[PDB]
Ligand binder design. Structure first.
Ligand code: A2B
Length: 339
């Protein structure tokens, strides 16, 4: 809403579908170093959220840097971390701070319904080229000047896949509860998608939905509260890794192994929980592809080639029944750079 669907957007602009497809080919393919030399090293800023159970961000940067090295790109990387739970006001402060650096590229994430126009005005202000992480759905308003790249693993797709699995695990009319992220974009695209699908297709009944602070502790708290008010459910759908892992501790504490719970993203900690059996299911994203895509995107730009506006990587579904070999194989695929 105010957003294009990833696939919708690629349909509407064929040239974009081409560029994105070309890029995915450039990601799958072996590194091809930089065609066009530079006058100086390029300066890149990263404003990321810190201290999360989720290893997505650190892995992203890892695979990113490794790719830039492989491409023979000479970069200087200024990192900044936001402590938690950093207010959106604080995050955007960290952001303005990173803008002073007058970098060539600026990689970051910010909730883009709660700070739509802010980011728009930032886009208008600088010559720094923006990379928006963790959003794969372009904003309609910004068709005049879109950022350099939205990069991520489509939230709607991953939530569709999970909805598809839950419809597979349970009868029509099954009771469940939902643990959202914080109020915002992510909860809208991960949560409300899942709920829409599961209500329409499987006639599931949503007992309750709770917002969180996007932290493990918060996930624990919200799970406890929710199950206190609404004990009778067959699963809980969680919108992020940290919240899921908190909810697990809650379900253990409460003795509720009659309740099923999913992860989101399938990083190391989730996979470990899946192998313990603490986590019933997850949608594991092929993590490093987006780190590698950003480096390929920068390469092109420096060769003066056109760059796609968006890139989404792919998911696989992982269940606690999967073989160690399949898990291992998927790690081989997903962390092929960050290990
Ligand atoms: O992609 C990163 C992320 O999205 C929200 C949160 O920051 C992370 O937790 B997650 O569930 O692993 O996915």
């Amino acid at each position: 809403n105010g957003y294009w669907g990833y696939q919708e957007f690629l349909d509407e602009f064929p040239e974009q579908r081409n560029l994105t497809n070309a890029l995915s080919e450039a990601v799958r393919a072996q590194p091809v170093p930089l065609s066009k030399p530079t006058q100086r090293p390029i300066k890149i800023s990263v404003v990321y959220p810190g201290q999360q159970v989720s290893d997505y961000w650190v892995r992203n940067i890892a695979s990113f840097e490794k790719r830039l090295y492989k491409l023979n790109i000479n970069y200087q990387l200024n990192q900044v971390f936001t402590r938690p739970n950093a207010d959106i006001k604080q995050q955007s402060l960290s952001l303005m701070e990173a803008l002073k650096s007058k970098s060539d590229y600026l990689i970051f994430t910010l909730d883009t319904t709660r700070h739509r126009k802010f980011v728009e005005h930032v886009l208008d202000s600088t010559n720094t080229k923006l990379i928006l992480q963790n959003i794969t759905t372009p904003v309609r308003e910004w068709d005049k000047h879109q950022p350099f790249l939205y990069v991520g693993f489509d939230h709607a797709e991953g939530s569709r896949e999970l909805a598809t699995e839950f419809g597979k695990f349970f009868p029509k009319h099954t009771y469940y509860s939902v643990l959202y992220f914080s109020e915002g974009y992510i909860s809208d695209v991960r949560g409300d998608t899942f709920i829409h699908q599961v209500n329409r297709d499987n006639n599931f009944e949503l007992q309750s939905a709770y917002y969180t602070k996007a932290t493990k502790q918060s996930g624990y708290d919200a799970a406890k509260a929710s199950l206190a008010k609404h004990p009778d459910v067959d699963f809980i759908y969680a919108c992020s890794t940290d919240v899921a892992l908190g909810a697990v501790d809650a379900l253990a504490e409460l003795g509720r192994e009659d309740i099923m719970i999913n992860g989101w993203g399938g990083g190391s900690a989730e996979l470990d929980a899946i192998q313990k059996g603490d986590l019933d299911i997850t949608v594991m994203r092929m993590n490093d592809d987006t780190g590698i895509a950003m480096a390929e995107a920068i390469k092109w730009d420096l060769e003066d080639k056109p760059v796609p506006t968006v890139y989404s990587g792919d998911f696989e579904i992982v269940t606690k029944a999967d073989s160690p070999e399949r898990i291992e194989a998927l790690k081989k695929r997903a962390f092929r750079y960050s290990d």
